[PDB]
Design an enzyme around this catalytic site. Structure first.
Site, PDB file in Angstrom:
ATOM      1  N   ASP A   1       1.046   3.302   7.573  1.00 45.66           N
ATOM      2  CA  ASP A   1       0.057   2.358   7.085  1.00 45.66           C
ATOM      3  C   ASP A   1       0.450   0.982   6.799  1.00 45.66           C
ATOM      4  O   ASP A   1       0.416   0.637   5.688  1.00 45.66           O
ATOM      5  CB  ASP A   1      -0.980   3.188   6.032  1.00 45.66           C
ATOM      6  CG  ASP A   1      -2.300   2.495   5.997  1.00 45.66           C
ATOM      7  OD1 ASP A   1      -2.449   1.297   6.674  1.00 45.66           O
ATOM      8  OD2 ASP A   1      -3.271   2.952   5.295  1.00 45.66           O
TER       9      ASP A   1
ATOM     10  N   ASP B   1       0.859  -1.376   0.170  1.00 40.30           N
ATOM     11  CA  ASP B   1       0.036   0.126  -0.231  1.00 40.30           C
ATOM     12  C   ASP B   1       0.734   1.401   0.091  1.00 40.30           C
ATOM     13  O   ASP B   1       0.669   2.216   0.738  1.00 40.30           O
ATOM     14  CB  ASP B   1      -1.108  -0.134   1.100  1.00 40.30           C
ATOM     15  CG  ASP B   1      -2.144   0.865   1.120  1.00 40.30           C
ATOM     16  OD1 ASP B   1      -2.375   1.588  -0.076  1.00 40.30           O
ATOM     17  OD2 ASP B   1      -3.014   0.894   1.849  1.00 40.30           O
TER      18      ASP B   1
ATOM     19  N   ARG C   1      -0.638   9.115   0.501  1.00 41.68           N
ATOM     20  CA  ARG C   1      -1.753   9.064   1.532  1.00 41.68           C
ATOM     21  C   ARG C   1      -1.139   8.336   2.586  1.00 41.68           C
ATOM     22  O   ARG C   1      -1.786   8.321   3.931  1.00 41.68           O
ATOM     23  CB  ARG C   1      -3.010   8.673   1.115  1.00 41.68           C
ATOM     24  CG  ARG C   1      -3.218   7.071   0.737  1.00 41.68           C
ATOM     25  CD  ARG C   1      -4.780   6.474   0.516  1.00 41.68           C
ATOM     26  NE  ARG C   1      -4.464   5.227  -0.006  1.00 41.68           N
ATOM     27  CZ  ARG C   1      -4.028   4.865  -1.086  1.00 41.68           C
ATOM     28  NH1 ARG C   1      -3.760   5.831  -2.050  1.00 41.68           N
ATOM     29  NH2 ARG C   1      -3.855   3.497  -1.555  1.00 41.68           N
ATOM     30  N   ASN C   2      -0.205   7.401   2.552  1.00 43.98           N
ATOM     31  CA  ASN C   2       0.431   6.523   3.632  1.00 43.98           C
ATOM     32  C   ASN C   2       1.880   6.898   3.663  1.00 43.98           C
ATOM     33  O   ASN C   2       2.548   5.973   4.293  1.00 43.98           O
ATOM     34  CB  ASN C   2       0.245   4.973   3.241  1.00 43.98           C
ATOM     35  CG  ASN C   2      -1.331   4.613   2.987  1.00 43.98           C
ATOM     36  OD1 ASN C   2      -1.864   5.126   4.005  1.00 43.98           O
ATOM     37  ND2 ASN C   2      -1.550   3.697   2.503  1.00 43.98           N
TER      38      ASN C   2
HETATM   39  N1  LIG Z   1       1.809   9.567  13.090  1.00 43.55           N
HETATM   40  C1  LIG Z   1       1.035  10.506  12.283  1.00 43.55           C
HETATM   41  N2  LIG Z   1       1.009  11.670  12.464  1.00 43.55           N
HETATM   42  C2  LIG Z   1       0.325  12.741  11.756  1.00 43.55           C
HETATM   43  N3  LIG Z   1      -0.782  12.163  11.056  1.00 43.55           N
HETATM   44  C3  LIG Z   1      -1.172  10.893  10.665  1.00 43.55           C
HETATM   45  C4  LIG Z   1      -0.313  10.011  11.524  1.00 43.55           C
HETATM   46  N4  LIG Z   1      -0.774   8.792  11.250  1.00 43.55           N
HETATM   47  C5  LIG Z   1      -1.978   9.098  10.357  1.00 43.55           C
HETATM   48  N5  LIG Z   1      -1.872  10.283   9.988  1.00 43.55           N
HETATM   49  C6  LIG Z   1      -3.119  10.971   9.451  1.00 43.55           C
HETATM   50  O1  LIG Z   1      -4.267  10.045   9.062  1.00 43.55           O
HETATM   51  C7  LIG Z   1      -3.792   9.584   7.736  1.00 43.55           C
HETATM   52  C8  LIG Z   1      -3.586   7.903   7.771  1.00 43.55           C
HETATM   53  O2  LIG Z   1      -4.307   7.124   8.285  1.00 43.55           O
HETATM   54  P1  LIG Z   1      -3.976   5.561   8.174  1.00 43.55           P
HETATM   55  O3  LIG Z   1      -3.237   5.640   6.855  1.00 43.55           O
HETATM   56  O4  LIG Z   1      -2.856   5.272   8.974  1.00 43.55           O
HETATM   57  O5  LIG Z   1      -5.017   4.432   8.285  1.00 43.55           O
HETATM   58  P2  LIG Z   1      -6.481   4.477   7.327  1.00 43.55           P
HETATM   59  O6  LIG Z   1      -7.195   5.891   7.473  1.00 43.55           O
HETATM   60  O7  LIG Z   1      -5.859   4.687   5.939  1.00 43.55           O
HETATM   61  C9  LIG Z   1      -7.435   3.155   7.377  1.00 43.55           C
HETATM   62  P3  LIG Z   1      -6.835   1.677   7.161  1.00 43.55           P
HETATM   63  O8  LIG Z   1      -5.400   1.884   7.983  1.00 43.55           O
HETATM   64  O9  LIG Z   1      -7.475   0.341   7.511  1.00 43.55           O
HETATM   65  O10 LIG Z   1      -6.287   1.637   5.568  1.00 43.55           O
HETATM   66  C10 LIG Z   1      -2.722  10.133   7.201  1.00 43.55           C
HETATM   67  O11 LIG Z   1      -3.152  10.671   5.913  1.00 43.55           O
HETATM   68  C11 LIG Z   1      -2.249  11.027   8.017  1.00 43.55           C
HETATM   69  O12 LIG Z   1      -3.336  12.236   7.544  1.00 43.55           O
HETATM   70 MG   LIG Z   2      -3.944   6.708   4.599  1.00 40.16          MG
HETATM   71 MG   LIG Z   3      -4.190   4.738   4.619  1.00 41.44          MG
END
Ligand SMILES: Nc1ncnc2c1ncn2[C@@H]1O[C@H](COP(=O)(O)OP(=O)(O)CP(=O)(O)O)[C@@H](O)[C@H]1O
Ligand SMILES: [Mg+2]
Ligand SMILES: [Mg+2]
Lengths: 113, 302
Positions: free
Chosen positions: B172, B154, B158-159
């Site tokens: 992520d 992935d 966005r990750n």
């Molecule tokens: N350590 C961190 N510091 C700042 N922002 C963070 C962060 N972790 C996550 N985010 C924010 O939340 C978003 C990412 O969330 P994440 O990618 O970890 O899980 P998710 O919302 O995609 C559902 P899933 O994990 O099942 O795919 C990032 O785009 C960021 O904007």
């Molecule tokens: Mg994300």
């Molecule tokens: Mg994500």
């Protein structure tokens, strides 16, 4: 015209990496030096501005040195001008740098490692 | 319904103060928080952290997914270009996965606010050298990830998180898998599929290798050099696979040199073995970064 060869900020033999090594030891904007480049009739002014190290080409041709759109009789004239006039973002030249200046306003180079 | 203990990673729930939301998914949520003493060397100092957790409408499976993602981060270990796992709340209450706070958000947001003029951060407008630096860091993080014999599955802007000092942190790990001593992961369930980042073999065979991650890396490169653009513009996902098998690839972004585009096109090679490894990506990006860095001269014409 070649009165620059006497000045504290001029270096006839100095690389880009060396100038970086020196400027990294003086975290002040306006710290600067001029170095001859390998290409004929070329110099570079290396200076600090808004926290970062910058390099600019300076070309000589006949009786004139050029920097961007500015033209001068000599390097000494160019430097003298950019002390009283901003060179890049309201930054004027302030601290001429060589190894003896670095002994006084420079961060100490670690002897051990 | 209960989770197994792991004392070295466990963190006290009073020691933790949940706060400002940072991200929300469907079943997931990330919130900012203050965790005092999460540094073992500074037992009395409060640390700003991020906490991943579920919504209340999450299922049992939603939970096992978050547990797995956490264990991936334990196994992967620490690297300067992978977001740091700090600890967890697994015991007596909701699962809190505690992670290093990145104050500049995800790479897509970060890039978009640092574009040339028309949220915006004008004094931090991206340069070509910065873009390459981003790419090199992510290449290094992936090279480490691959050396731990794991795949990300992935990679996308966005990750990726950006820290206060502009460090790229791969994040992520919810699709990530261990492929030690097998060297492919074969997905048997259907699922969430980031279709526009997937190699054609993964779209088709549902099989993932270090090679398909490299394909995703190329799409990530494109995202970077378009400064946060969305892949395959005007193309729906149902049509991408056919398009990809018959030779379609994204165009060169303007911020991209021919060389970096060719790198990009090489990650998207139709034959997986003809793609570069992350190791080769690192070496070539190191070279390009250094060349770019050593050849910068400020232009005072404007
Ligand atoms: N350590 C961190 N510091 C700042 N922002 C963070 C962060 N972790 C996550 N985010 C924010 O939340 C978003 C990412 O969330 P994440 O990618 O970890 O899980 P998710 O919302 O995609 C559902 P899933 O994990 O099942 O795919 C990032 O785009 C960021 O904007
Ligand atoms: Mg994300
Ligand atoms: Mg994500």
């Amino acid at each position: 015209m070649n009165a620059h060869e006497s000045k504290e900020w001029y270096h006839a033999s100095l690389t880009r990496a060396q100038a970086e090594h020196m400027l990294m030891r003086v975290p002040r904007d306006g710290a600067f030096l001029v170095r001859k480049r390998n290409e004929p009739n070329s110099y570079a002014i290396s200076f600090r501005a808004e926290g970062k190290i910058k390099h600019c080409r300076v070309q000589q041709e006949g009786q004139t040195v050029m920097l961007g759109n500015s033209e001068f009789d000599s390097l000494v004239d160019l430097i003298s001008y950019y002390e009283k006039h901003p060179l890049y973002r309201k930054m004027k030249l302030r601290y001429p740098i060589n190894e003896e200046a670095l002994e006084k306003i420079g961060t100490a180079e670690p002897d051990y490692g | 319904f209960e989770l197994p203990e792991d004392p070295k990673w466990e963190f006290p729930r009073d020691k933790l103060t949940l706060g400002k939301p940072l991200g929300e998914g469907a079943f997931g949520q990330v919130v900012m928080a203050e965790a005092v003493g999460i540094d073992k060397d500074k037992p009395k100092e409060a640390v700003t952290v991020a906490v991943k957790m579920l919504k209340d409408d999450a299922t049992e499976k939603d939970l096992s997914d978050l547990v797995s993602e956490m264990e991936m981060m334990k196994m992967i270990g620490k690297h300067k270009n992978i977001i740091n796992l700090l600890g967890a709340c697994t015991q007596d209450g909701p699962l809190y996965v505690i992670v290093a706070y990145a104050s500049k958000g995800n790479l897509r947001e970060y890039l978009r606010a640092r574009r040339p003029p028309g949220n915006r951060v004008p004094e931090e407008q991206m340069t070509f050298k910065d873009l390459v630096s981003c790419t090199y860091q992510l290449a290094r993080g992936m090279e480490y990830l691959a050396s731990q014999k794991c795949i990300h599955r992935d990679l996308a802007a966005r990750n990726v998180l950006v820290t206060e000092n502009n460090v790229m942190k791969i994040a992520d790990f919810g699709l990530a898998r261990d492929i030690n001593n097998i060297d492919f992961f074969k997905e048997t369930t259907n699922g969430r599929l980031p279709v526009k980042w997937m190699a054609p073999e993964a779209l088709f065979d549902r099989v993932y290798t270090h090679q398909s991650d490299v394909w995703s890396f190329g799409v990530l490169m494109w995202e970077i050099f378009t400064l946060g653009g969305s892949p395959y513009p005007g193309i729906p996902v149902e049509e991408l696979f056919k398009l990809l098998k018959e030779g379609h690839r994204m165009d060169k972004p303007a911020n991209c040199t021919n060389e970096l585009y060719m790198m990009m096109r090489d990650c998207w090679h139709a034959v997986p073995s003809q793609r570069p490894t992350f190791k080769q990506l690192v070496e070539d990006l190191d070279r390009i970064l250094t060349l770019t860095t050593n050849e910068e001269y400020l232009d005072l014409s404007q």
